[PDB]
Design a protein around this ligand. Structure first.
Ligand SMILES: N[C@@H](CCC(=O)N[C@@H](CSSC[C@H](NC(=O)CC[C@H](N)C(=O)O)C(=O)NCC(=O)O)C(=O)NCC(=O)O)C(=O)O
Ligand SMILES: N[C@@H](CCC(=O)N[C@@H](CSSC[C@H](NC(=O)CC[C@H](N)C(=O)O)C(=O)NCC(=O)O)C(=O)NCC(=O)O)C(=O)O
Ligand SMILES: CCCCCCCCCCCC[N+](C)(C)[O-]
Ligand SMILES: CCCCCCCCCCCC[N+](C)(C)[O-]
Ligand SMILES: CCCCCCCCCCCC[N+](C)(C)[O-]
Ligand SMILES: CCCCCCCCCCCC[N+](C)(C)[O-]
Ligand SMILES: CCCCCCCCCCCC[N+](C)(C)[O-]
Ligand SMILES: CCCCCCCCCCCC[N+](C)(C)[O-]
Lengths: 600, 598
């Protein structure tokens, strides 16, 4: 198992490798081979070109058997120039050939994470700020892309080139040259790395201060009226100014440290240059080496250290990239609390009854909410579930849609344990109008059609009509194509709840749940929407969970929860007659509304 | 000055005083030092290939192995040291200049910030925090990168190009000179046209990226709804199509970079082939040494090294100049509401308020006040009410002079508020607006905001007067509790009490309640009405309200209709008159009856 290993960069890359070599595609695998071939051609080329330059100088200084020297030297100079152009061509062709592969690999990584995020439990409460998440994901995407590019196109070729230079220097010089350049590369890498750790710290402090200065400015600008009301302009300016100075100080330190890195790098490189060239000319002095060899060695060294001129940034980005990617893999690895059992049959609803069979449940194991809740909802009846503050009624919907499983006991629909069926069929059987309905950032029509995957215009129109929002939509300038939600037209609470009703009408489920559906609405809106809700509950099993008892008094039967168990059951009149918990709640709520009514 | 072609040149010319302050002489010293490093660095990089040329010449005018070794050694060492010194000079120039660059862009930012505070309210300052922040982040990055590339990439390259032209002129060709000049012209032109194309592709890619990301985020933030409709596969397919559109665009954009690099390499290497072939030919005729080949090759590669980035540099310098011109456009934008020259301070000895024939609208095609006149006596509790078209929602904004009347005038005490300093005018006014805002700071900072040097004792007294002191006392950090986001979230009543406390710290003679209770629930509203009445104690108070029962105890009620004063009097006189106020009263009472009925 690759997962059974040390949690480092090597493991992360090893996990990423199958994305780069799909074994699903074969058009992409070809592209990868082609890209590798371009790396090889490009290296062969850049290694070959300095020999051409060397021969040209040799022809000019040892015209003994390289005649006519003019023709020979010209030929080699053209070979050198053509070589430079060719090296660039091969490099860009490898990038171009590979790009599709990279984009596909990262797209598939992202898709796997996205799917897993939808599979994971509700208790991670993914409802947070849009801008924060977006900024983070933008940052991570850029990060992983840069990492991938630098590993494949900067680090790998440099390793190939470095080994080649070692062999070629070995076969033709020194070997003191080989040890000098290897020591040089080691010094260079170590220096760059240690300086880069320091620079990355300074960069983090800089960025933090920048965010603070910007936040002060933005808070001020979005609060222009308040700033005016209190004549606080100068105060705000001074307050931005101090933060902006703290940022400028940190920025100066951060940028300066780059100068220190460049100077260190140049010191190492140029010491090696001085030594190698001195050694080469000395070798010439003894008749061992040609003058062309000087040009050859100098060229080999500058070509070698060219990609390493970015090593600081390369190091910072590959590191951050590996961290960001390991985070992706940690999500994909996180285990799924609620899964279909192996080979789960579809739930088959012929008679839509609902049974809670001795249900024990809580969100967290240190706080049990339901203590053995049992009840039976008849097929086609309209039932309500009510209780006081600790009753646990707010769990019913979440259990029924299997956002969570019972700790003990079970829930059945049509005599079938919902824990043993596919989640998709289970949810196909259920409609819900929740307390707070949320709209996608899309058109109102898209939002209504969302109730069913292939929903036609007629179905949407019919539901909008059934939810009595059709007229409201007709009066919108852009009608069904009116963008709603954030970044869009603002709907009232009643209008959103009507869009939700319309969604469930599109879905047409056999069992429908009103989950505190009217609790966020004002009194008149609540009363208006109740006739609509009653009409849509027509030939379905309906379960309404409500705080205000009068809104559910017309139910076929009412289930009263107390302390996570079923305390009372029956019609509204039977419950008033029993003079128990429901009667007390009813009396209290009526008194409350009477008192509120007194304050006119 | 501003009277110019409005191009990159004008923007840069405007920016120059920021780099050469004439306020700061240390920064000027720094600029001079940076320039000296530019010149030393160039002298160095121009000199080093001559050293390399000599080393080769010494090994080739070697009849034998006579003092060529010492000379060649000396010259290669000069070459390596020259390289290191060039890098040292470049990095020291950056290091010397950095403080100057940072101070210049800071002062530009501060000037923009100050002017934005001077500009009109109607610039619709209400947006997303994340959007403006993203825009400002992008823009600062843009201006910094532009500044760095202009000073350190383009300018030294111009210096070097002129130097290389002269040197090639004096020592070669002159065909060499025309060849390199032609190369550079073709190079710049090619890079520019390809870059315009690439920038279009980049913009499309960015848009598609934003769309795929927005789909993923809207999905995750709607996790419950997706579960409710069992819509996971659907959302996956929807993210996937967008992500493919993005990938196709990313492939095109990145590939076009390869096309740019190849075009550039073609130009550079044609020039290389020609220059070196011609130099070798000059050698064959005894005109040029073999060192000259190495010399020319080095000069050309050094010259074209900074131009290796020219596409990015061009894209960036261009965007930066645009963003900076935007900055200058705001600084230039004219101020709608200004103090008259030598405007006196407002002196409130008796805090009366007069609207004298006020004609006003936010836009000249929609008049709201049509000649509004009324007098508010000093120290009275007055309410302003009206139906849908009355214009009462303009009063607060006019009184604080966020706008001027089109016709007529507003007086406080006996003085036209248009002829006094704005600061003194606002110093006389308190407001509790409908939607109260908290800064992202402590509760104490938020209350203390009412007056510039407000002490903790003052903050305490105001918190007490607003009846929020106990709530603060039960907080662990009390007044040092952070509020706003990400901070403790306050109820509506708690927020309005903070606003009230803020105004108490200011302690103004005239106090405005501008729909102060309209966002509050009934119970909260009734609670806050006693605090508000108490806080109105020795001030001139003006309450603009929708719900009449909340203001019925006022000394007098001004009823506006169609932007004029229709009715005036106490709640009882107004019910007796059986006019517009009586009708509004009856209607509102009937509504509360209907709501109560359900
Ligand atoms: N030809 C294209 C530009 C090609 C290009 O973008 N090349 C680079 C960007 S260089 S941008 C990076 C560069 N180097 C560094 O920042 C190195 C700093 C330190 N030495 C370290 O090791 O990190 C820099 O910013 N220098 C500042 C300056 O010279 O003024 C790249 O993306 N990949 C390199 C490759 O694969 O070939 C064009 O004309 O626009
Ligand atoms: N911009 C490319 C896209 C391809 C690319 O890879 N470009 C380079 C440009 S680096 S350009 C580097 C330059 N840096 C600086 O000016 C000083 C910062 C110093 N390099 C450091 O490392 O600290 C800068 O503008 N910012 C540095 C930073 O924010 O990290 C890159 O490697 N990444 C950016 C990208 O993908 O577009 C294009 O033109 O197509
Ligand atoms: C594609 C690989 C290119 C290999 C280039 C080989 C360079 C040979 C170096 C010449 C050796 C110098 N000398 C005169 C001492 O023999
Ligand atoms: C906070 C970590 C969770 C991030 C997981 C999000 C995965 C889908 C988003 C990928 C976006 C791809 N992009 C930016 C190129 O469009
Ligand atoms: C999978 C391709 C793109 C996905 C975007 C990357 C995710 C953002 C990084 C997650 C958190 C980063 N980190 C480690 C700083 O927390
Ligand atoms: C309409 C947008 C106008 C934006 C101008 C606002 C300038 C405020 C200063 C922001 C500077 C932030 N910084 C430089 C520290 O990153
Ligand atoms: C230095 C670059 C500034 C160039 C500004 C030129 C704009 N213009 C006139 C071409 O439109
Ligand atoms: C330290 C840098 C301070 C400079 C602040 C400049 C912010 C630039 C915002 C420009 C955005 C203009 N626009 C509309 C084109 O986006």
């Amino acid at each position: 198992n690759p997962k059974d290993a040390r949690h480092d960069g090597w493991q992360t890359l090893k996990r990423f490798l199958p994305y780069l070599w799909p074994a699903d595609n074969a058009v992409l695998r070809r592209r990868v081979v082609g890209a590798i071939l371009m790396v090889l051609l490009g290296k062969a080329t850049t290694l070959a070109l300095p020999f051409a330059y060397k021969k040209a100088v040799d022809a000019m200084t040892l015209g003994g058997g390289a005649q006519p020297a003019l023709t020979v030297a010209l030929a080699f100079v053209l070979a050198y120039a053509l070589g430079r152009f060719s090296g660039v061509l091969f490099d860009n062709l490898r990038n171009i050939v590979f790009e599709r592969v990279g984009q596909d690999a990262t797209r598939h990584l992202a898709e796997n994470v996205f799917a897993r995020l939808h599979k994971l439990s509700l208790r991670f409460h993914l409802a947070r700020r849009t801008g924060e998440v977006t900024k983070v994901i933008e940052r991570g995407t850029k990060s992983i892309d840069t990492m991938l590019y630098f590993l494949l196109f900067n680090i790998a070729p440099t390793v190939i080139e470095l080994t080649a230079v070692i062999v070629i220097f070995w076969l033709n010089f020194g070997l003191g040259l080989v040890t000098a350049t290897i020591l040089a590369v080691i010094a260079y890498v170590w220096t760059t790395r240690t300086i880069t750790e320091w620079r990355t710290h300074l960069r983090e402090k800089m960025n933090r201060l920048d965010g603070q200065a910007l936040a002060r400015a933005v808070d001020s600008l979005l609060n222009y009226e308040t700033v005016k009301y209190f004549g606080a302009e100068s105060r705000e300016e001074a307050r931005y100014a101090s933060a902006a100075r703290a940022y400028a100080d940190a920025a100066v330190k951060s940028e300066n440290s780059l100068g220190l890195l460049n100077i260190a790098q140049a010191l190492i490189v140029n010491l090696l240059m001085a030594g190698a060239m001195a050694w080469t000319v000395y070798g010439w002095s003894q008749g061992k080496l040609t003058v062309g060899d000087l040009v050859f060695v100098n060229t080999y060294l500058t070509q070698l250290f060219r990609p390493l001129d970015m090593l600081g940034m390369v190091y910072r980005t590959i590191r951050q990239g590996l961290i960001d990617m390991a985070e992706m893999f940690r999500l994909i690895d996180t285990h799924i609390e609620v899964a279909d059992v192996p080979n789960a049959p579809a739930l088959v609803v012929n008679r839509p009854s609902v049974t809670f069979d001795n249900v024990v449940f809580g969100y967290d194991r240190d706080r049990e909410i339901l203590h053995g809740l049992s009840f039976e909802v008849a097929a086609g009846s309209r039932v309500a579930i009510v209780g006081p503050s600790g009753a646990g009624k707010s769990t019913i919907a979440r259990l029924l849609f299997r956002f969570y499983d019972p700790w003990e006991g079970r829930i059945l629909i049509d005599g079938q344990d919902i824990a043993h069926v596919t989640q998709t069929s289970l949810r196909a059987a259920l409609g819900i109008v929740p307390q707070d309905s949320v709209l996608f950032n899309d058109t109102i029509g898209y939002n209504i059609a969302y109730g069913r995957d292939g929903a036609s215009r007629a179905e949407v129109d019919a539901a909008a009509k059934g939810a009595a929002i059709a007229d409201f939509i007709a009066r919108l300038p852009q009608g069904y194509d009116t963008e709603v939600g954030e970044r869009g037209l603002k709907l009232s609470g009643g209008e959103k709840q009507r869009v939700a009703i319309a969604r469930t009408l599109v879905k047409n489920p056999p069992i429908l749940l009103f989950d505190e559906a009217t609790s966020a609405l004002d009194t008149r809106t609540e009363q208006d929407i109740l006739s609509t809700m009653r009409a849509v509950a027509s030939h379905r099993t309906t379960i309404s969970i409500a705080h205000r008892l009068s809104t559910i008094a017309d139910s076929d039967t009412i289930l009263v929860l107390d302390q996570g168990r079923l305390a009372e059951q029956g019609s509204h009149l039977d419950l008033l007659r029993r003079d128990g918990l429901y009667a007390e709640m009813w009396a209290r709520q009526a008194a409350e509304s009477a008192e509120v009514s007194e304050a006119a």
